[PDB]
Symmetry: C3
Subunit: 428 residues, 3 copies
Amino acid sequence: ENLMQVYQQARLSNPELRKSAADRDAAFEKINEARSPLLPQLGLGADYTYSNGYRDANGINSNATSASLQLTQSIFDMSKWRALTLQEKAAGIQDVTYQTDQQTLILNTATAYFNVLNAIDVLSYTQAQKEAIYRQLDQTTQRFNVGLVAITDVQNARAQYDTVLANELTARNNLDNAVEQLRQITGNYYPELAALNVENFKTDKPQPVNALLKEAEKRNLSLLQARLSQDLAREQIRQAQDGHLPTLDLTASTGISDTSYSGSKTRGAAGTQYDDSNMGQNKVGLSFSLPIYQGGMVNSQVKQAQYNFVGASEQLESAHRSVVQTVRSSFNNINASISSINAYKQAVVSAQSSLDAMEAGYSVGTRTIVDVLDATTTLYNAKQELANARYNYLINQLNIKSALGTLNEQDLLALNNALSKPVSTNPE
Amino acid sequence: ENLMQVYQQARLSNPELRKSAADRDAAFEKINEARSPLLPQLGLGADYTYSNGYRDANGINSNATSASLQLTQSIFDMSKWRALTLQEKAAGIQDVTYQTDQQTLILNTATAYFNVLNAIDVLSYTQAQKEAIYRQLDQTTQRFNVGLVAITDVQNARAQYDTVLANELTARNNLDNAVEQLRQITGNYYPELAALNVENFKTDKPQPVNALLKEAEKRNLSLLQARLSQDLAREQIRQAQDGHLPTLDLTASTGISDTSYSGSKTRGAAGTQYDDSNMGQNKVGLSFSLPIYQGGMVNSQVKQAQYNFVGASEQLESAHRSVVQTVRSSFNNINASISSINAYKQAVVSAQSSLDAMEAGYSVGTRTIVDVLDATTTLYNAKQELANARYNYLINQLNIKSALGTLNEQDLLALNNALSKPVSTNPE
Amino acid sequence: ENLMQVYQQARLSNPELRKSAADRDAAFEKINEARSPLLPQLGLGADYTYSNGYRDANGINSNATSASLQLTQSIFDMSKWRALTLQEKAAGIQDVTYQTDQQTLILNTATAYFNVLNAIDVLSYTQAQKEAIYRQLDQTTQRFNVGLVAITDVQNARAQYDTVLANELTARNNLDNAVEQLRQITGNYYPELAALNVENFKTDKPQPVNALLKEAEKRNLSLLQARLSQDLAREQIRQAQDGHLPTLDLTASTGISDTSYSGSKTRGAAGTQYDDSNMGQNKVGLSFSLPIYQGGMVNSQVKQAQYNFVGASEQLESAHRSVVQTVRSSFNNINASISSINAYKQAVVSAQSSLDAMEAGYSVGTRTIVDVLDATTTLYNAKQELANARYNYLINQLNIKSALGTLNEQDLLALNNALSKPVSTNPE
C-alpha cells in the first residue's frame, strides 16, 4: 500500500487519462480521413424520367431510363496535402497534451497519498488535546464542589471541552474526506497506508538554477506545444496562398441507356431520324480551371493568416517567460522547505525538554498531572507540524522535477526508501 | 419582506434564469428546422439569355428566355432522421441545465439573504466594542492628567480607539455591500428583513448515508446530463454508419421558353429548322444513387465515433465518482455544523455568567465601569458566533438537498417558518 | 527607474497587448473579405474528352477540346450587405476589447511596482527582528552558563532564533519572485525603483457616489461591449429574414473549340451528320430565383434569431447591474483605505514614543539593550504597515479610475510625482 502500488493501479483506472488517450486516438485516426479524398471515388447513378411536352410540342410523349458509373481522380491540387500536414501537426499537439496529463496524474496521486497521512497525524494530536482538556475540567469541577473556585470557571472549562470535541469531529470528517479523495483518484478504498520512515530522511540539495533553466528550455511540455502551434500557424499561412494554384481532375464514366421512340406522329415517313438506337457511352476526359480575379478574397485571407501567425508568436513569447518564472519559483520553494524543516526540527527538540521536565516534577511531586498532559499535547503539536513539513518537502521536489518535465515513474527509489510499516487510515 | 417573498420576486425578476429559459426555447425551436428537410421544397426560376457565338456562324442572332418551377421531395434517407433524434437529445440536455439553473438561483438567494443578518450582528457588536474602548481611553487620559501614568500609555489607548473606528467603518461598508449584492439578484432594495426566531429553532438528525446515495443515483441532475450525452454519442455513432446506405429522390418541373431569332439572312429557304419556337415541357422523374468506394471517409468516421463514445463513457464515470464524493462531503458538513452550534451555545452561557459576575461586583463597588463594558462586548461577540453558526446549518441543509437533486420551493418554505421578526437593514 | 519609464517600456514590449493589437488588425481585415463577393468574378474551364460507342454502336468517335472564360456578378442580394454590417460590428467589439486590455496593463504595472517596494520594506523589518532575537539568545546562553536558568530556556531561545532564520529566507525568496514577476510584464531587470516621498502624499476626498455612477454609465467598457453585442444580435435577426427574399445575378462567357473527327467505319451514309465542325458560344443573360413551401426552413430560422436577441438583451441587463455593484464597492474601498491609513499613523507615533522611553531608560542605566532592540523591531513593523497602507490607497484610486472607464497614461503621470528617492532592490 505504498505510493508505487497505489500509482500502478491509478495508471490503469484513472478516467482523466483515459479520456486523454481517447482524444489522442481520435486525433491520430483522423489523418486517414484526410488522405481519403486524394484516392479515386466510385458511385452509381441509376434514375428514371417521364415527360409531356406542351405549348408548341403538343401531343409528344416520352419516357427515359439511364444508369451509369463515375470515377474522379485528382491529379494536382496541393490543397489536400496541406490538410495532411496540418492534421499531423494537430496529432503532435494532442500527444503533447497526453504527456502533460500523465505527469498531472502522477502528481495528484502523490499529493492525495500524503494528505491522508497528514490527516491521521492531526487526528492523533486532537485526541491528545481532548484528553488534557477533559482532565482540566475534572480538576476544576472537583475544586469547585470542594470550594476554592467560582462557577464561572466551571463553565469556562466546559466551553473548552466542547470546543475540543468539535475539533475532534472535524478531524474525523477530514480523515474520511481525504480517503474519499484517495478513492476518487485511484478508484479503490485503502484501509492501510505506509508512512514515512523518519530515521532515514534525506534533506538533499538542488542543482544550480541556470542548469535547470537550460533543461527546461530544452524539454518542457508547455513551450513545446507552443512551438507546435507556431509551426501550425506557418503551415496555415502556406495553405492560404494555395488558393491561386490551378487545379485539374481526371474523370471517366461509363453506362448504358436503351431509349425507344413511339407515337402516331413518329410512325410513318420517319426518315431514319426517329429510329431507335442501342449505343453506349464510355466517356473519359480531364478538366482544368483557375481563378483570375476573385475580387481579392485570397489576397485578404493571406493577410488574415499573417496576423494569426504574429499573434501565435506573441503567445509563444509569453509562454517562454512563464516557464522561466515558474522554474525560478520552484527552486526557491525547495530552499524554503529546507529552511522550514530545520526550524521545525529545532522546535521539536525544544518541546521534548519541557515534557521531560514536567514528568520529573510529577515523579518527585512538584507538579500535577495536568501539566504533564498539556506538555504531551504540545509535543504532539511539534510532531504533527514536522511531519507536515517533510511531506511538503517531498511534494515540492516532485513539483520542481515536474517543471523540468522529466518525471513519469523514475520516482521509484525516491519514495521506496521513504516508506515504513503500514498505518491504518480509518481506525475503529 | 422575508425569505419566501424575496425568492418569489427573484423567480421571475432574475435575468440569469430567464437567459436559461431563452436557451431552452432556442433548443426546442431547433427541432423545427431539423424536420424541415423532410417536407417538399417547392421553388421558382426565370432566366433570359442573349447569344451571338460566331466561331463559324457570323451574323446569327438568337435570344433566349425561360421560366419554370421546381419541386423536390426526398424518399429514403437516414441522414435526416438521425438529425431529428440528435436535436431532440440536445433539447433534453438544455432542459437539464435549466433545472440546474433553477436550483442555483434558490441557493444564491438564500445565501444573499443570510449575509445581511450576519452584517447586522457584526455591526452591533463592533459598535459595542467602540463604546468600551472609548471609555477606556477616557479613563486613561484622566489618569495621565491626574499624574499616575505616563504619556506612553495614552498613545496606546488612542491607537486602539482609531483601530476600532476603522473596524466599525469596515463593518458598515460590508453591510452596504451585502445589501447591494442582494439587489443584484432581485433588482430591488429591501429596507428591512426578517430575522431568525431563536426560541423556535430545530436541530434534526440527517438520514442514513446509504439512502442519500440511492436517491442521488436516482435523481442527480449532472448524472442525467452525463447519461444523455452518452446516448447522444451512441446515436451519432449510428448516424455515421448511415453514410453508406443509398438515397432516393423525386423531382418535377414545368416551364416555358421563347428562343426567338432575327435577321433577314436567316429568313428564306431556311428549311423550317431556324424558325422561332414556343415550346413547353413538363418533365418529371426520380434520381437514385448508392456509393461504392469513397476511401477512408466511410471507414474513419466510424472509428472516430467509437472513440468519442468511449470518451463519453469516461466522462460519465467521472460524474459518478464526483457525485458520490459530494454527497458524502455535504453529509459530513451537516454534523460539523451541529457540533459547532453546541460549542458556541456553551460559549454564550459562559460569557453570560462572566457578565453577571462583573455587574454584581460593580454594583457592590469592587469593579470600575470600564470592566463592565468589556464583559458586555465579550457577550455581544459571542452572539456573532452563535448567529453565524445557525445560518451555516441552514445553508448546509439547503446544499445537501441540492446534491440529492430534490431542492424545490417546498424545501425552501420550511426555512421561512423560523424567520418571524422584522429588522432594519440600516440602523439610524 | 521610475514608474513612468517602466510603463513606457512595458507598453511597447508587452506581448499580451500586442496580441490584442494583432487581433484587432486581423478583425478589421475581415471587412475586405466581407465585400469581396459583391465584386465581379472570373475563371476558366478548359478541358478535353474522348467518347466511344459500343454494343453494336462501334465505329463512331468524337473528340472534345473546350476553353472558355466566365464572368459572374450579382446585382441584387440583401444577404451580402448583412455580412458587411456584422463585420463592422465585430470591428467595434475588437476595438472595445483592445481598450480594456490597455487599462489592465496599466493596473498590472502599478501593482508590480508597489509589490516590489513592499517586499523591500518587509525584508528590512525581518532583518531587524533577526538581530533582536540573536541578542536575546546570547543573553540567555550567558545566563545559563553563569547558572541562573535551565536548559529548557536555551532550547526555547534556539527555537525562536531558528524560526526567524526561516522567515528571513522566505522574505528574500518573495523579493526575487516579485522582481521576476515584474520582469514578466516589463521584460527587464530593474536593480532600483523610486521610493515614496512622504512629504507630499495626497489623501483627497472622492466625489459623490451618484455622480460617479452616472459618469461610469457613459464611458465604461464592459457595458459598451454589451450594447454592441445586442446591436449585432439585431443585425443577426435582420440577416435571417432576408433568406426568403428574391435575388438576381448576371452571367457572361465566351469560348471556342475544334470538333474534327476521324475513323474508317464512320464513313458511309453519313448524311452530312458526321462532318467536322468548329463552333463558339457567347451566351450572356440574367437570372432570378424566389423560394416557396420550403417546410419553413428559414421561417423557423427567424424564431432562433429572436430568442438569441432576447438573451443578448438579458445579458446586457446583467452587465448593467454588475457595473452598479462594482463601482459602489470600489468607492467603499477607497474610504476604508483612508481610515486604515489614519490608524497606522497613530500606531507609528505610539511605537516611536515607546522606543524613546526605552532608549532613555537604557541611557540612564535602568534597562538592558534587548529592550532597545525589541522597541526598534516594533517601530519597523509599524513603518512597514503604514507603507503598505499608502501603496494600497494609491492602487485603489487607480482601480476606481479604471472602473469609471477613464484610465490612461496621463492619469498615471500625476502619481509619478509621489516617487522621488531611488532604492536598491538587492542592496550589497
